[PDB]
Enzyme design. Structure first.
Site, mmCIF file in Angstrom:
data_model
loop_
_atom_site.group_PDB
_atom_site.id
_atom_site.type_symbol
_atom_site.label_atom_id
_atom_site.label_comp_id
_atom_site.label_asym_id
_atom_site.label_seq_id
_atom_site.Cartn_x
_atom_site.Cartn_y
_atom_site.Cartn_z
ATOM 1 C CD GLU A 84 -3.005 -1.028 0.314
ATOM 2 O OE1 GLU A 84 -3.122 0.168 -0.188
ATOM 3 O OE2 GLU A 84 -3.731 -1.951 0.041
ATOM 4 C CG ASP B 271 -8.482 3.288 -5.242
ATOM 5 O OD1 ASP B 271 -9.023 3.639 -6.397
ATOM 6 O OD2 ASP B 271 -9.065 2.568 -4.448
ATOM 7 C CG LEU C 175 -12.497 3.674 0.297
ATOM 8 C CD1 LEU C 175 -12.085 3.862 -1.149
ATOM 9 C CD2 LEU C 175 -13.633 2.684 0.335
ATOM 10 C CG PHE D 183 -5.912 -3.870 4.517
ATOM 11 C CD1 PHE D 183 -5.522 -3.016 3.471
ATOM 12 C CD2 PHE D 183 -5.864 -3.373 5.815
ATOM 13 C CE1 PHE D 183 -5.052 -1.731 3.718
ATOM 14 C CE2 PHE D 183 -5.430 -2.063 6.067
ATOM 15 C CZ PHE D 183 -4.995 -1.258 5.026
ATOM 16 C CB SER E 102 -10.552 -18.188 -5.708
ATOM 17 O OG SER E 102 -10.040 -18.092 -6.989
HETATM 18 CL CL LIG Z 1 -12.700 -16.970 -8.253
#
Ligand SMILES: [Cl-]
Ligand SMILES: [Cl-]
Length: 162
Positions: free
Chosen positions: A11, A20, A32, A104, A117
């Site tokens: 970051e 950003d 943010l 985060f 995933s």
């Molecule tokens: Cl995915």
């Protein structure tokens, strides 16, 4: 290496409001401020978060205090979420760091949406997971950071960051 050092590399540290990669108003260590295109809104959101009329600028200590809050929030969001928790539970300590890095960066909701995933991670199917994560908008938008995170899941080591 730890989650705090990992995120400070990903970051960076900015003391003045900025936009950003998705053009939102941010400050400090990836904090943010708002999704509103108004710079006055961002300035307003900033004064509330710091509790001081700042005029768009913060001190390093302020940025650090915001960082501590955001890492805590990320960890608590994971643990509270029915989709995220079991995934975290299943993982080694390095790969847990990778998941907190994603939360985060894109919020609980955002990561909670990476259905294919997360299931592959839970099954410890490393390569399939890395390949699926590589097709996300996320990956295409901030490729160098995403590859580091991805390699962290693929391998279970801190190599991408030495
Ligand atoms: Cl995915
Ligand atoms: Cl990048």
């Amino acid at each position: 290496m730890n989650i705090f050092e990992m995120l400070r590399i990903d970051e960076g540290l900015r003391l003045k409001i900025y936009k950003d990669t998705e053009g939102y108003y941010t400050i400090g260590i990836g904090h943010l401020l708002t999704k509103s295109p108004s710079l006055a809104a961002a300035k307003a959101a900033l004064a509330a978060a710091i509790g001081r009329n700042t005029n768009g600028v913060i001190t390093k200590d302020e940025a650090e205090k915001l960082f501590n809050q955001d890492v805590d929030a990320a960890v608590r969001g994971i643990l509270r979420n029915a989709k995220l928790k079991p995934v975290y539970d299943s993982l080694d300590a390095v790969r847990r760091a990778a998941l907190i890095n994603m939360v985060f960066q894109m919020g609980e909701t955002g990561v909670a949406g990476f259905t294919n995933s997360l299931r592959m991670l839970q099954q410890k199917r490393w390569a399939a997971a890395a390949a699926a994560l590589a097709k996300s908008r996320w990956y295409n938008q901030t490729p160098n950071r995403a590859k580091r995170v991805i390699t962290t899941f693929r391998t279970g080591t801190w190599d991408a960051y030495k």
